[PDB]
């Protein structure tokens with residue numbers, strides 16, 4: 001679990017969105033596993049606007065942060081689950097690192113701010129849904 005709070009927005013994994021998230025829907029993209037809902041309170045996370053390929057992510061299954069090198073956002077094949085059929089997930093970045101299903105929502109950050117959130121994993125690889133292109137999150 002985990003979310004990004006920037007301005008009047010809450011960014012979560014689309015497969016983990018709540019009833020409240022859907023009742024206050026701003027935008028969602030099944031192909032990205034992202035959903036953004038509105039909030040009454042003001043958020044202070046800073047979104048990175050960069051092409052960083054190194055950063056640190058929070059791994060709840062280990063109660064630890066890990067430094068990683070990650071790939072640029074791309075279309076990557078993702079196995080079927082109770083949430084989605086087998087498909088290509090877009091805007092996804094991979095790194096060599098530990099992750100388990102309850103790890104989705106963990107933040108990946110570089111020196112510039114929030115890069116994205118944990119969205120996939122398995123086989124010693126963790127996948128992060130990028131948020132750096134969503135420029136509207138700041139306005």
Ligand SMILES: Cc1cnccc1CC(=O)N1CCC[C@H](C(N)=O)C1
Nearest residue numbers: 033081084099100101119120121122
């Ligand atoms: C096995 C594992 C390890 N770390 C994080 C997550 C996981 C599970 C996993 O990859 N997915 C299940 C939930 C939906 C995901 C998606 N974006 O389609 C895919």
Ligand SMILES: [Zn+2]
Nearest residue numbers: 050052110112
């Ligand atoms: Zn950066």
